Design a protein around this ligand. Sequence first.
Ligand code: SF4
Ligand code: SF4
Ligand code: SF4
Ligand code: SF4
Ligand code: FES
Ligand code: FES
Ligand SMILES: [Zn+2]
Lengths: 181, 159, 47, 91, 94, 118, 688, 291
Amino acid sequence: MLLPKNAIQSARYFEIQKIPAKIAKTANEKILSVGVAQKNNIQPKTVTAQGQIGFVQHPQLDSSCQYTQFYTPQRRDIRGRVARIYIQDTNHMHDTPQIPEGYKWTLEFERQAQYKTPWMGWSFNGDTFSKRNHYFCTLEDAISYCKQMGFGYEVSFPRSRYHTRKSYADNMLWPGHDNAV
Amino acid sequence: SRLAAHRKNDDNSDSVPFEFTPENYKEIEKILAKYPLKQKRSAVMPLLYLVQEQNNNWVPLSAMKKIAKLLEMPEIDVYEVATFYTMYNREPVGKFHLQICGTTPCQLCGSREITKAIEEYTQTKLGHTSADGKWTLEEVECLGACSNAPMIQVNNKWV
Amino acid sequence: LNRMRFITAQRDRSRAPWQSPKGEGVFQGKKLIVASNSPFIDDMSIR
Amino acid sequence: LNPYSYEALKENHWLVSDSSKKNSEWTHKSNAEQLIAKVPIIYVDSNIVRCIGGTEINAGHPQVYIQLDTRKHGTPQTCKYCGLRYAKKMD
Amino acid sequence: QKLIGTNLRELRFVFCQNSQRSLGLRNYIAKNYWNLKNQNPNFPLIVRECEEADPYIIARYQYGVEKKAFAANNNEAEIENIIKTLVEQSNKVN
Amino acid sequence: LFRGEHALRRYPTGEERCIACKLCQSACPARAITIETEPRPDGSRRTVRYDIDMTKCIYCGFCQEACPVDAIVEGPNYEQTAYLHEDLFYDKYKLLENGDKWEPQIARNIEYLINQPL
Amino acid sequence: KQIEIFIDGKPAKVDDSYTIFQACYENGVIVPRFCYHERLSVAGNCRMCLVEVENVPKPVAACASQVVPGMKIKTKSEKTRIHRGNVMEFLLANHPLDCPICDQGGECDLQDISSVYGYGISRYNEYKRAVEDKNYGPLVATSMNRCIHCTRCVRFATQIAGVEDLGKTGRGKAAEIGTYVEKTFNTELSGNVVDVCPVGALTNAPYAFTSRPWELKSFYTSDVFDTLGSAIQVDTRGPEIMRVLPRIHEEINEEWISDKTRHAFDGLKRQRINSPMKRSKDGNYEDIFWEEAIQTISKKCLNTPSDQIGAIIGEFADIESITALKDFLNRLDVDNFEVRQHGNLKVSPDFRANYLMNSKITGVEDADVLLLVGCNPRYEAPVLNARILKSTRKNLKVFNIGTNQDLNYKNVHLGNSTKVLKEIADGTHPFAERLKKAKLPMIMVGASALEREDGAELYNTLKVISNKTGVISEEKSWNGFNILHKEMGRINALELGINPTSVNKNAKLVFILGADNNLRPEDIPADAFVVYFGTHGDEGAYYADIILPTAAYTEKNATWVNTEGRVQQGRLVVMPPGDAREDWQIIRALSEEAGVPLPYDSLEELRYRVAELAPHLLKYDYIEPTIFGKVALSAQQGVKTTLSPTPITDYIDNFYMTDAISRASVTMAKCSTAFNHEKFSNFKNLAK
Amino acid sequence: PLAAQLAINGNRNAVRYENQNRTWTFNELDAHTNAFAYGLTELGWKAGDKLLLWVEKNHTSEITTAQVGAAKAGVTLVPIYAHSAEELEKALNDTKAKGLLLSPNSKAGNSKYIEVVNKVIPELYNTGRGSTLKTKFANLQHIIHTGFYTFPGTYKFRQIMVYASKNFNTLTLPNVELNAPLFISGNQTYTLKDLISKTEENRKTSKLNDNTPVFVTGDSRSPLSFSLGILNSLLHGNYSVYTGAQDLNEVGQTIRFYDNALLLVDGDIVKATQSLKHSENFAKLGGVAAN
Ligand code: SF4
Ligand code: SF4
Ligand code: SF4
Ligand code: SF4
Ligand code: FES
Ligand code: FES
Ligand SMILES: [Zn+2]
């Protein structure tokens, strides 16, 4: 999930890391043009696993999204959707799962209408696209997939425990002199 | 010395009062002086022994809470100490708490015969207390004087 | 014929609609006064 | 005996009780609670009772053990797999 | 400066805290915020700092009408002139 | 060993043998079992809804194999032809009724199955 | 000092402070454990982390053993396999056959380790140990037969929290971990006991017998019940939500969450508004369409002059909703965003430093002296209370001016009135010299104190005291001035710049954006028209002439700013119930119908408008530094600075009932009825 | 006067509250009473200021702590037995009390104490947060309720309490004056010296030795109850146990353990109780006294 630093220095890799800056096209975007400029100036210039500031990237309906297969006459909502990219860690309930998690980046889609039918109370999803999460080895691969499929993506970087000194001798400690104040 | 928790008894409720006598307070002061001033937590066992001496050879829950308050330590610590150490009777016992050693040396010397004789004389079974609050039989581990076995101890005092 | 009970129960398992007041009700300024429907007893208030 | 009272909740493990046992007929679609409630408390001399839910292994539920030496004498304990309630025969 | 409360409904300064492009507006605000607040006690003067953010002075006049002035690489005198123009243009706006 | 119609058994006392462990639900290859459980007022761990979709289920027997208390058993009944598709959405009521009706033969088969390992 | 070791013949380098387990984890080789926890003390009871060292005959406990130069560790050796198998067999001996009925069936680390490392078949064919169950309250269900005597619960109770009730009572196989007496474990952090317990001995009672881990989908989001903000994981099986858990976020959450945030999600399951409603003069509520509701609201807005239009900000208001409401009111010429006059927060929203905690949630770990003014961290932000307990156990002294609450750590109670503040400001109080001597002091003030009628005077007194005592020191580069808030909606409004002091004395058209606390009939004029954007009908829905359903924090994809100034993104887990619509969308539709369309039609455009207003909110999970703290908090000359001779109190009365969701929740009601009488005490626990 | 027991042996138990199940040693009782006195002093209570007592039997600990703190601070306490808003207002007007400590959840007639107080003083409902009381009486500055919830214009007992620091206490406690009035019962006023004399006379009459534990049933606001209860324990080092509203049955259940224990019995409790279920519990009562 982490190749050696600067192991890959390809133009495609750099393009994947870089995020495009939006261009105001809609009337609302033009009205809020100052906001678009501020967002472009403020958002991180590149995405890397060492990043720490979360951000949301708009879907790029461009020639780069030509590889998407989820744009069909019947379904025309999958493309342009916004996903979430984050590392799913093991649940706090247990510490040594049989199948450990946290070794891969999960891409998730917000679930749409979920309703229990009257005849039997069974659960039904209005859309079947956001039932299963996607998994990638690297955030670079996940972002490349999002760009290729034309999906916008929010990225939330992981947080882990801070290493602390551990020793059994800390159980026994001398409080100090009684007269100490 | 049967259950690892507080037995629901009407005579051992939290409402039961307990107050150390002035002699017990003086002994507690001496024990604290013997122990380090800051490490007052080490005086649990002497306090439990004093409580047993003051009471009918058992430590009430109210007495344990009083010990914890005096020592400025959690009551759970006192509970743990009392439960862990079996010489503290958490429930009332009879006038004579017979403790028959049952380790291998005494068994070889014939501890079983002595236990049977005691049961026959006292009209009660091992462990169980006699109908009248006079006898309480118990089986214990090596009391130390194996070369003089068979052996018994009374009130944890006289061998 | 009793499908309504089952449907309502299934719906409430995840989301129970709030039972709004109906008909004439007491008003204190711009507020409708209704007794609390919570089965649980407010022990602190009572004693 | 208000089911929502603090005493009732503490006695029933913070669950609303149904004395008539009739609500279960709809809630769980069975009268099994009523059927099992008829069985009386089984008195066992030993402090620990072994339950298999039958006469032989694999004919009931997994072998389980229940402590009858409750901190309060004579308190029945219900098996988790089956509703049979066992109590120590205090004498 | 005394008529800001009546002329405008809100003043806002959005800039960067560690950029030369914002240095001028940053210093002007740091120097004159208390003066402006004393001149106009209850007027809203909002200050927002964001790294690599373009300097901007946003004056909200009335009826959801706002004017945004780009104050990059502007001396304190230029900031004063821009703020004065924004305050004076309230009559023209409404 | 014949696997016919799913049914739910009870203890000789009448108590439900089914505990909401959802092992049968997890093992069901066709996802034909839906289970929702809430604590019973007496405090027992019992299901509040146990549905089997006979049309979606393959008569494999994984439910009975995975049941740790022999609650769900695929009894020998096979003449379960239905005219309405809704009649094949077996519910907890239907499963309990089937178990009550077919307990004798199911118990007789289970006796031999349990005694075979011995 | 770096030291070279070998793990299965693989060279590695680690500092001497590392233990065998820590080195293994860093190098990527997993070691089973039952009693070792990262944040708890080191114990060697379970002895399941035994490994093989070439030069050590006896097995070495990895968790409680430090590395040695040249150590040859064989974690894959047959001897290591035998050790793991023996330990697992001993652990499973006497363990009840309760896996089908154990609530941790799918999340049992014991099962996982037995399957991966231990043997596949057991030899113990004998009567097992049987232990009586215990009653710890409606939050923890106890099955002590499954206990492995790892003491993790005891260590958590003694160390993470100040409550000292759990302990290992007894000796031998008869030892029982728990309270010797029959009492409930009613600590505010009782939920994490289940998490720390690995063998399902202690479980989530409300969640008991509900579902299994393998049929749950998890979403990462941020807590809203507490202004502190907590990184939580929400598990859902379809529409239904269940088992809210914490997730590792050391800066703010430190792996722990409070009972309120853990068990208040049940409020969303009932008393939910699912359709627009209108109330007649007689008081008979009736459902109506969104089109009709918006049309009537727009007609009322057009008819009503902007002078007599006001708004009330709710407790759970978000950035998007508040921005939409602000834009709509500005386009209508409405500038007053408060209608309540009884209590208003006395703080200027100009600078973020003057209404946000200048020192972060981790600033307690750095400050040497911490003074609270009308703050009860135990009831508000219990995780912050645990952090303060850690800080005061390592190096920190806590002083309190106000009520003497049963804090888990010792504190020095200076007083409860404003006399102490006056003396400190004048400099005659010895605490001024104490602060001057102390380095990196911190001042934490609850929002109630600033909401007092003399809140402005108290705030100015705090400013002058901090400036004089060095709480805001340039040489130290320290700003210990902090404010603990009670309304995420208020925090968001201050971030967006809405003035809390602007109150419309007489308002003919009131817009209540999901506000349910502090509402009284006197606030709303009898002749006014009220439009209430809400999700629960416990309060605010009875003052409303029109009621509009809105989304909750688990159902709205929005942004939330916590008390320390960290901006996080609250994600959508399930869609709003019934016909509920997002509040920002409702405001946009209302604006369009009224004839003042807003320049945003989607979340992206609304967030562009948010960037226009305050760009720093687009940097999620980050705290933007501010260099105007000293200017904002500088004490002015000629200010009133006149305090009143009255006690400083705390607004929280029942920790389990603080918002509409908590009031509507059932688990919270059970916790209240089970804990209020046991916790209420007019006196102070002198033991701690 | 009130620290002799602390000087001799502060570790000994001071008082027991069976109804609320809490026992205080001499040190703990002194700490709580000093905290109450410091709180009153910080609020601005002076010598001779009047505080009305409207707390029921169950709040025995609150009653005792308030009494001892008032004695330490030289504040006079006036118990009031009013079941009606008319009586409450009449007492307030007659006494011109600076403070009023009451029990909110208590029921008087068809209304609670808090409701009656609000009716008598409607200004409390709209009183600002942190604002001084501007009432008709012009002197009832402080209103305190011994309840879990909070109400506008009122403060909780714990909030009023202020625990002084060892090195950060700027407050001062005026020396206790024996002649200063402490209790105003009916039309008769009792000073601390008079109460001490009453304690001595009652002990002599009842043969109350030092080691004989005392029990008090019913309201502890009575001057006789105060004399033979907490005051007796603080003077002679005796052990007092308050049963509050507990009936004779529970009082006897508690008494069983105590031997040769004096008992103070309230007429209201006697009327409330029907009969003694277990008379054996009182077989060793030693002595019995009536209010
Ligand atoms: S036979 Fe197989 S598919 Fe059908 S219900 Fe049983 S386990 Fe499921
Ligand atoms: S049928 Fe068997 S496997 Fe399925 S939930 Fe019931 S007991 Fe568990
Ligand atoms: S804790 Fe014990 S009973 Fe529960 S799943 Fe694990 S092994 Fe089975
Ligand atoms: S209850 Fe759980 S956490 Fe506590 S000692 Fe037992 S197994 Fe460990
Ligand atoms: S063998 Fe009996 S005392 Fe040791
Ligand atoms: S993890 Fe090492 S002994 Fe438990
Ligand atoms: Zn069984």
